[PDB]
Amino acid sequence: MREVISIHIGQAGIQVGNACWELYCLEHGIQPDGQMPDDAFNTFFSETGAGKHVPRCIFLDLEPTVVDEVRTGTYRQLFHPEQLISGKEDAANNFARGHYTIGKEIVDLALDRIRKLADNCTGLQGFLVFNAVGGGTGSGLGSLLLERLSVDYGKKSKLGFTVYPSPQVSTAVVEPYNSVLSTHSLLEHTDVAVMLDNEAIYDICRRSLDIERPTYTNLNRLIAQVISSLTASLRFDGALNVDITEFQTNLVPYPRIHFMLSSYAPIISAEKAYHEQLSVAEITNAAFEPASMMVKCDPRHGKYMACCLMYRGDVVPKDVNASVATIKTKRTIQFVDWCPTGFKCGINYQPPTVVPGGDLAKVQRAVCMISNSTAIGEIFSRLDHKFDLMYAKRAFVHWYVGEGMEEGEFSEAREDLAALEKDFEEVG
Amino acid sequence: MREVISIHIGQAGIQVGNACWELYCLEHGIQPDGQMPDDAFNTFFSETGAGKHVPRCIFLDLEPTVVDEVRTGTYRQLFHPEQLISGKEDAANNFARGHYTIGKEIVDLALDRIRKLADNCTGLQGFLVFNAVGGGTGSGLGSLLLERLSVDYGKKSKLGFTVYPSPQVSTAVVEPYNSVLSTHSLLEHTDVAVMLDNEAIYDICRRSLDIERPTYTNLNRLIAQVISSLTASLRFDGALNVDITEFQTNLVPYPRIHFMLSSYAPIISAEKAYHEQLSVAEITNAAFEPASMMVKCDPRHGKYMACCLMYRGDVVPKDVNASVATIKTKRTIQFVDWCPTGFKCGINYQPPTVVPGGDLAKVQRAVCMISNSTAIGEIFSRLDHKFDLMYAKRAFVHWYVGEGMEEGEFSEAREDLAALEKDFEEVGAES
Amino acid sequence: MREIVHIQGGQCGNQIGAKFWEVVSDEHGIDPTGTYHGDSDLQLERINVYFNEATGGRYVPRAILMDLEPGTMDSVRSGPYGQIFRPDNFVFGQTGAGNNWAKGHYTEGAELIDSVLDVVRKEAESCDCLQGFQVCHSLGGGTGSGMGTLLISKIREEYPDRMMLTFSVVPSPKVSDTVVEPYNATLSVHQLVENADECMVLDNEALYDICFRTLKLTTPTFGDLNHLISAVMSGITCCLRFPGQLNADLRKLAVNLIPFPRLHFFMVGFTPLTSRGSQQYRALTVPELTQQMWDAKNMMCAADPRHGRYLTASALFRGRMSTKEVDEQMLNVQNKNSSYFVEWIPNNVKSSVCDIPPKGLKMSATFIGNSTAIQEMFKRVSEQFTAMFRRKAFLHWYTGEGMDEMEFTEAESNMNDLVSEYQQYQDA
Amino acid sequence: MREIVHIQGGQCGNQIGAKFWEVVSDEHGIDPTGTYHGDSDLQLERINVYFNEATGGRYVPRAILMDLEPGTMDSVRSGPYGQIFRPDNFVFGQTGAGNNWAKGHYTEGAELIDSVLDVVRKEAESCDCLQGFQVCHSLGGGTGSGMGTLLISKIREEYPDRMMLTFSVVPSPKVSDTVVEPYNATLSVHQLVENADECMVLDNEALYDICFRTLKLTTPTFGDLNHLISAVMSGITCCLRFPGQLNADLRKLAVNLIPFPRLHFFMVGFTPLTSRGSQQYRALTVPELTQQMWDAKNMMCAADPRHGRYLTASALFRGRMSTKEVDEQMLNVQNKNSSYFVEWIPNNVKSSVCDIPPKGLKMSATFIGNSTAIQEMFKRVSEQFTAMFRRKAFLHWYTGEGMDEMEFTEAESNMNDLVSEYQQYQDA
Amino acid sequence: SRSYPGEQVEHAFNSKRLKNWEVPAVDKSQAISTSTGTRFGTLQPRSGRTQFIVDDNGHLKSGVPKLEKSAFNFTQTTPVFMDSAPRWPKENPTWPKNMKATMGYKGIQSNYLPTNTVTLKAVEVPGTTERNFNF
Amino acid sequence: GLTSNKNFITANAVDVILAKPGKVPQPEFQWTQKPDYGKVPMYLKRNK
Ligand SMILES: Nc1nc2c(ncn2[C@@H]2O[C@H](COP(=O)(O)OP(=O)(O)OP(=O)(O)O)[C@@H](O)[C@H]2O)c(=O)[nH]1
Ligand SMILES: Nc1nc2c(ncn2[C@@H]2O[C@H](COP(=O)(O)OP(=O)(O)OP(=O)(O)O)[C@@H](O)[C@H]2O)c(=O)[nH]1
Ligand SMILES: Nc1nc2c(ncn2[C@@H]2O[C@H](COP(=O)(O)OP(=O)(O)O)[C@@H](O)[C@H]2O)c(=O)[nH]1
Ligand SMILES: Nc1nc2c(ncn2[C@@H]2O[C@H](COP(=O)(O)OP(=O)(O)O)[C@@H](O)[C@H]2O)c(=O)[nH]1
Ligand SMILES: [Mg+2]
Numbered sequence A: 001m002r003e004v005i006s007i008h009i010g011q012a013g014i015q016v017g018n019a020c021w022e023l024y025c026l027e028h029g030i031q032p033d034g035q036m037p038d039d040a041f042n043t044f045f046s047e048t049g050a051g052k053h054v055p056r057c058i059f060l061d062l063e064p065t066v067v068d069e070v071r072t073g074t075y076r077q078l079f080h081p082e083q084l085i086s087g088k089e090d091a092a093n094n095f096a097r098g099h100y101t102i103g104k105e106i107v108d109l110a111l112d113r114i115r116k117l118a119d120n121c122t123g124l125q126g127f128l129v130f131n132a133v134g135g136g137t138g139s140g141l142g143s144l145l146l147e148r149l150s151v152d153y154g155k156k157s158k159l160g161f162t163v164y165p166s167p168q169v170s171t172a173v174v175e176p177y178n179s180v181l182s183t184h185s186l187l188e189h190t191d192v193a194v195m196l197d198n199e200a201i202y203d204i205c206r207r208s209l210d211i212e213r214p215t216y217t218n219l220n221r222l223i224a225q226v227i228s229s230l231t232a233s234l235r236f237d238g239a240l241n242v243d244i245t246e247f248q249t250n251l252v253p254y255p256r257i258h259f260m261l262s263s264y265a266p267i268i269s270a271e272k273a274y275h276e277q278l279s280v281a282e283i284t285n286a287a288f289e290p291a292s293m294m295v296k297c298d299p300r301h302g303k304y305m306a307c308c309l310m311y312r313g314d315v316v317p318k319d320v321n322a323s324v325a326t327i328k329t330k331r332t333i334q335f336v337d338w339c340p341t342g343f344k345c346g347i348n349y350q351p352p353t354v355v356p357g358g359d360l361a362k363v364q365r366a367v368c369m370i371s372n373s374t375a376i377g378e379i380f381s382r383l384d385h386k387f388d389l390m391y392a393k394r395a396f397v398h399w400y401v402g403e404g405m406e407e408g409e410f411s412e413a414r415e416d417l418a419a420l421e422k423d424f425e426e427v428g
Numbered sequence B: 001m002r003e004v005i006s007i008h009i010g011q012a013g014i015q016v017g018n019a020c021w022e023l024y025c026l027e028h029g030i031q032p033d034g035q036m037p038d039d040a041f042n043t044f045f046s047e048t049g050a051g052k053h054v055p056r057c058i059f060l061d062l063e064p065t066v067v068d069e070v071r072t073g074t075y076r077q078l079f080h081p082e083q084l085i086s087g088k089e090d091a092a093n094n095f096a097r098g099h100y101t102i103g104k105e106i107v108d109l110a111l112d113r114i115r116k117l118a119d120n121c122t123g124l125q126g127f128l129v130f131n132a133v134g135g136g137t138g139s140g141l142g143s144l145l146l147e148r149l150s151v152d153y154g155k156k157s158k159l160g161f162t163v164y165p166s167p168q169v170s171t172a173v174v175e176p177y178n179s180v181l182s183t184h185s186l187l188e189h190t191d192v193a194v195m196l197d198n199e200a201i202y203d204i205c206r207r208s209l210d211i212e213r214p215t216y217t218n219l220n221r222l223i224a225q226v227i228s229s230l231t232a233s234l235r236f237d238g239a240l241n242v243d244i245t246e247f248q249t250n251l252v253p254y255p256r257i258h259f260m261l262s263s264y265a266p267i268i269s270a271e272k273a274y275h276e277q278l279s280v281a282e283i284t285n286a287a288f289e290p291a292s293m294m295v296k297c298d299p300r301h302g303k304y305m306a307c308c309l310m311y312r313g314d315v316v317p318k319d320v321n322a323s324v325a326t327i328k329t330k331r332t333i334q335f336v337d338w339c340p341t342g343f344k345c346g347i348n349y350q351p352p353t354v355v356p357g358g359d360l361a362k363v364q365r366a367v368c369m370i371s372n373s374t375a376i377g378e379i380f381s382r383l384d385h386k387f388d389l390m391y392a393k394r395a396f397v398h399w400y401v402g403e404g405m406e407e408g409e410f411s412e413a414r415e416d417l418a419a420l421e422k423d424f425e426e427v428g429a430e431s
Numbered sequence C, D: 001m002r003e004i005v006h007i008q009g010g011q012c013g014n015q016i017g018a019k020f021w022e023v024v025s026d027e028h029g030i031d032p033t034g035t036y037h038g039d040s041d042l043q044l045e046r047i048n049v050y051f052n053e054a055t056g057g058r059y060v061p062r063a064i065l066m067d068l069e070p071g072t073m074d075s076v077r078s079g080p081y082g083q084i085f086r087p088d089n090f091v092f093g094q095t096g097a098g099n100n101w102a103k104g105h106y107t108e109g110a111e112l113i114d115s116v117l118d119v120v121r122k123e124a125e126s127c128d129c130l131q132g133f134q135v136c137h138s139l140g141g142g143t144g145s146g147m148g149t150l151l152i153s154k155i156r157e158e159y160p161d162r163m164m165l166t167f168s169v170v171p172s173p174k175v176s177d178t179v180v181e182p183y184n185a186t187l188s189v190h191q192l193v194e195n196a197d198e199c200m201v202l203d204n205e206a207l208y209d210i211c212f213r214t215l216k217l218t219t220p221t222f223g224d225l226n227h228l229i230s231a232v233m234s235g236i237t238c239c240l241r242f243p244g245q246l247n248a249d250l251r252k253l254a255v256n257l258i259p260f261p262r263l264h265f266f267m268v269g270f271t272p273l274t275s276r277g278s279q280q281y282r283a284l285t286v287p288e289l290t291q292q293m294w295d296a297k298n299m300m301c302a303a304d305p306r307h308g309r310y311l312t313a314s315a316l317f318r319g320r321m322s323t324k325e326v327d328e329q330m331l332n333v334q335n336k337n338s339s340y341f342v343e344w345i346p347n348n349v350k351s352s353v354c355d356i357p358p359k360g361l362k363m364s365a366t367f368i369g370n371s372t373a374i375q376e377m378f379k380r381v382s383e384q385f386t387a388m389f390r391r392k393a394f395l396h397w398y399t400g401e402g403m404d405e406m407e408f409t410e411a412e413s414n415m416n417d418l419v420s421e422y423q424q425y426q427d428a
Numbered sequence E: 001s002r003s004y005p006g007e008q009v010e011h012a013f014n015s016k017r018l019k020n021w022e023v024p025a026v027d028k029s030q031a032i033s034t035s036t037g038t039r040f041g042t043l044q045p046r047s048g049r050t051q052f053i054v055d056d057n058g059h060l061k062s063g064v065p066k067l068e069k070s071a072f073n074f075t076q077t078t079p080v081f082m083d084s085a086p087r088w089p090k091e092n093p094t095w096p097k098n099m100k101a102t103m104g105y106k107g108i109q110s111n112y113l114p115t116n117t118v119t120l121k122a123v124e125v126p127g128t129t130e131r132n133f134n135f
Numbered sequence F: 001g002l003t004s005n006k007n008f009i010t011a012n013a014v015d016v017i018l019a020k021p022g023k024v025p026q027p028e029f030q031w032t033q034k035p036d037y038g039k040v041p042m043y044l045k046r047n048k
């Protein structure tokens, strides 16, 4: 009844889709063979007339080399085969091919799947978009897919958990280009867009979890922990139940500013749990810790326009109000004047779940923080520098203008960042 | 009392009649040897003095090479051999041969057999005509048969399921001529026509059944399913019974516009069935989906004028009503203004039957949607443009003029088709 | 029903008929004693298209062997399958034709035709519904060409409604077996334009390449080329003899191919043909067949399709195959090579199929194409004719038979008109 | 999906093509008989990138062997893995090429071309979705340089969308197999600039050093060098053939590499390479690989990158490894040795990885880098060319084939504008 | 087609409660002249003499003000609301594009049988026709 | 020598600036908008 639709685009979108959908199948006792040995699974599934629970997700991509693994992996009986969409060839780290050449003959094929995937929902909250900004399929198909959604749904809430090009660590040379073009395309079409970088989560894996051989399957396991902690109120009881509609309202001051930060606490090894107590005050303190941010942005250079908190486990409301009061007494944290408020809160009586073979520790308190800081103008600016740096010689452009783009879409997409940059200062 | 007569002309006619009758015998428990181990078979069969159920069909053709396969097959004890009608020589993909030269020798025996077949009938509902437009026999001989049937009965109702010449996939080169000729000939005589295309059904078999190499028999299985769904209400109980006259009246708005599309849902594989739920709302959405149309027409290039739906199995009228209301509220479905109404719905308690060694999956709900849209203007334009491109040079015309025709028949047919497409334009235009 | 009577005129005619009736006989499992010894009943259902039941269960062909110089008929009476023919269907003349079109058409022909026609009628009324005639020729000689055409122009009046086929072996400048070929060619062609419904033109050139390149044969003897010609003649009448999910009798193959009453010159090719070395690298699929049959190397005539534009084409597949795979291959061709097909014919290929492959294979195909490159066969001949007739060499061998000279201009003009018919419809 | 097709032009191309297919065939575990006798299902998953099914489960390569002097096509037919090619895909000529670019590109090329294009299309249609072509040249001789580029300048007009590589072996500055070698180079370079998307340059000299310094080999045979070239050609398509936590198709590797359509001259290096002595002292870690590949010794072309400035680079790793370690390593390189990298490209590396190493190893790597030191090569050949061309030495050989003198100046100046593009873009 | 207000049962007939979140088509209800102009208002009465504007076969008989090219929904004006899904006889990344066919030419033309391979020549003599086909 | 002495930087910039955007897939042509959709064609007159 409290239903959502989860979309995964590109390789990253699918590489996290394996993580999250391994979590939920575990969080509701769902065997990988569909069935299990109500109103709980109905948020992410569809109990057919006899036994089996089909997930209400859609894995969209162009390279066959990832979706076939899912078709041969253990989670192959799960997905309706028509949901897993895969093409012949990919966009090849090029925004045009994902936006003008290849994307245009598969969107409607995805829409027919999304169409029939929205009707079986009796109460819809909103779409969840997992994106990979910096590639061709994620940045190209994604932006093209959202506009087709905005004309088809318009008012519905579309969230974006868009992984973002890291400052130093980078596995691409053209990723400044297809990132800029992505934002100006999603800026007017996503309702709210969370950000997160692969490097910022690498250090989390270094300091806290103390894993020195980290891989992507060590990061995607950290993202599923966020959303499981974000959509607990949709499927689990607990005081201060909070849905998605009430999430964008008290968090997005202007129609432009919807780029936000994320955090999580605690994040500890299996053994230091036997060295700690994890009081609720300690958690929310470490939640505001810049070192616990999932983006390589520094909040201590800017001010907070809003905050959102999702607690979980053994938490009672007096201490949330007691400890938040303390953080508002601290001075390292600032708030822009025109929001004396700023703390939407949430509780859940279902502690986070642990995965066999995972790296987290069994705990009973946790916090997933989401904030809209004005310091997010710094990570924004570098993309405007490297774009402007390469665009002066117009290197690599003969590829974009070779696949159905012209010079307009470059300056067009470049000014909006300038317009958005001043917007991040007009609020000060 | 609820009895119909079936006519399978040309090759594809009997090719699909074989599937329809393997369906009906299995559905009613009739062994291939005529008899089984009332009012349920009487729609399609006739009981002799003891046990034998002979079908009330006719298989008409000009090539012995297929009627003899039928005569030698396992389905040889069924038919009165006088029903299986064959000729010494074929029409050779030539409308003139099928109409003027060859078919006029066996129309006499076809008509007297139809007379003897309709005599035993008490209450006759109508004539089903399974035809394949594009081949000389099919086209010309069906035109001749329909003219004779209209002058004989007139008051009876003729449905014609016409496998239509396809846009690109085509096993012929002259068929743009005989398609126009057959249309101009039968238009005044058929009471309703259901169009369906090999390309569209190929695409359906590809995308739904996961079969990649259908040898003209999967298409026939699908057509058999469609007719079984369409004629259920004649021989099976259920709320909202619907018969042939009710079917044609609220569906044919003008004397000219009587060609209509078709669809079916669900149509899936034995594993997607077992891994899906197929509620009635999903079924109706899939039926009204364009990618389920059995013809190569896109309904989003036009506006509906009426629709007919036949639900089968575990279906409830409130759910039917709610799904139709949802379809109406939807924005991608258009309707020509002068029909605020537009849906004739019927229900049957009998779920669709499955065949041994088949390819569909056992389901409990199914829908056969039949709509009359103003988008078949596009297929008429295609056919007319192809006829034009060819007849601009008088290509192949010597065959038609030698086999007993003249030139004026091409101009009459082309002007009739131009008028028909102008009709399909105007009657849809709104004030 | 649809009986067929078969003529074999000339040495070549009497020689390829020996293979044809050996190929078909094996296909219907009849010993050289005429007794049936097959396995299935599909050999008995339509046997009456070629044979006549006799006493004791003998099946005797509906053949007619006409030739001067009986020195060839003791060869067919010597071969393994030489005992099956009715000895009264053996019209031979004690004298010869000396490689002269005139005497094979005026002096000696006119002395056998009175008898030959009593043979052809004895087995034209033995049929309930006669389908048509078919002949085999060699346009170079005098017996095959002369008596060949003289026999034809007699059939065209006694049976104008029925259909006449012609497997003419056109001469070629590369294999100059004799000298007076061009005279014997045109004088025969002038008889084929008016008195023939279809005319497949085959050449010893392309009959040699397939043996040297495709079949990689070491010593291609005429006993091996006849194994190639006899293949297509059996590949034609499959739908007449055997069932098929899409049959195609002899007449509908004409109307679907010849738009204007003159262009009855076709071009053939059989598939599949492999070496004994490549049976190891080959797959038995339809796409393999549909590539070899369209390959311009297989065309049994030495006219290159890459210079003309296909008016129409055909394909007679055999074997229990899938019809969708053949309906789209013949479709994918025209879409790609759009220039090599005329535009005032939208879909210019006809496709047949039979469920009964040859006696040894599981899948086989046969091709017929009506291209505008067939003029090249007529350009070369009309050149050598006008080179010598301009000087009137060797002519006293034709006039001495009563012939006039005006028959040498009509026979050439009627060609040069036919050569231009094939160029109007070639828009380059 | 992602089908390739592989060309082998010339003696070298027909001799290193032997080794390439002896590496892949082992990688997918197919016996010299052709039949597959591997272990896992990972072989049969993406076999269709390089092979075609045949009866009885046998895979033949989609290679094309073109070369004059059939005296080499007996060697490949007699090599261990020679019985796997199709006998059709052997286009030879009984005439020699004479180490003359003219006749290889003007006379003897011109008649073999169509006989090769008839072949390439017979396996350009066999593909489901063609990825692109790839060639193995040798810019010294006449077969690889004359028929090589002439084949390219034909492939480019029938398949311009697709993507063609070039593993061109270039002439050597100190080693001179032949005397005319400078001419056959420049006149061939002038073809690669306009009809090649990517072109790696290999020289036998760096192949000799790596064979003497790293491998410490006593007798480097030609069959040993090609074990290096065939090692990197197989190292490109590891993402095409096997899963990987960061896969990279071939197309996305080019766009991230060439900023402008002309600077497609790359530089390769394979790792790890070690004697049978140092296999005792070496550790199989990622910092070992990235140290050896960035060295100025693995550069299989004899140009020193410390004289130029890397525009971009790449790395294709294989073996279950940590995806962070491979990112922080490549991150350090740009920061420590920050002078050899350009300024207007912020992040100028790309990093892929595949879960499947080579058959006999556990971890490997592969390097591609588009430097500006590559202009030292084109300087060397442009000194020897303008030396002997100034006096028309050995010129009567080229002009006898219909060539002229402008065909030299064009090809020379087209190397001068090219050698400055690499210079003006190299701002120290 | 229009949607006339079913007054007491007008609730539970919005698109939402019918599980349709796709920006409902409201013109089918707004073309009507209801009192409040919305789904819940009652409509208006008429005199009801009901003239004709059309002869027997459609084809608006007089100069009735009509919109041309309706009932067609042309491509140049089809908002992204309306859109088609391509079907099989058409290339697309989802279904496989099976193999195609081309014609491969005869070979290198000669005076003997055409061959694919080029051979040496004993008598070069520029511009002369001498071969040894027999080997 | 014939050195060009042109600024390849500016040349490539101008080429990228003034270039055709590329190839986009055209929409499937509609037959409802065929010019003769309503009326009888011309050549039929001369055929009569
Ligand atoms: N958190 C996380 N990020 C990933 C993962 N895999 C790749 N990324 C990052 O996603 C970005 C590119 O990923 P892709 O999905 O391949 O890009 P794309 O949209 O598919 O574009 P194409 O590769 O051209 O098809 C890079 O920045 C990666 O670092 C993963 O497994 N987890
Ligand atoms: N759905 C379906 N279509 C078929 C089948 N067989 C043939 N068709 C189509 O019917 C058309 C030809 O009709 P035919 O009946 O074979 O020709 P005809 O009417 O008998 O005329 P003649 O061949 O001259 O005797 C072709 O377009 C076929 O694609 C079948 O078994 N199923
Ligand atoms: N394919 C084929 N052609 C033949 C054969 N025998 C002769 N030909 C050709 O027949 C031509 C001469 O005609 P021929 O039949 O020998 O003398 P005719 O009796 O006057 O017609 C020559 O071009 C021969 O090459 C044969 O057995 N097979
Ligand atoms: N790596 C490698 N290089 C070779 C080999 N054989 C020849 N080369 C080089 O190829 C160059 C000449 O080209 P070649 O292929 O031999 O003659 P071509 O057919 O006319 O091109 C010479 O510089 C040889 O050194 C080989 O087997 N391996
Ligand atoms: Mg990607």
Ligand SMILES: [Mg+2]
Binding pocket: B010, B011, B090, B093, B135, B136, B137, B138
């Ligand atoms: Mg027929």
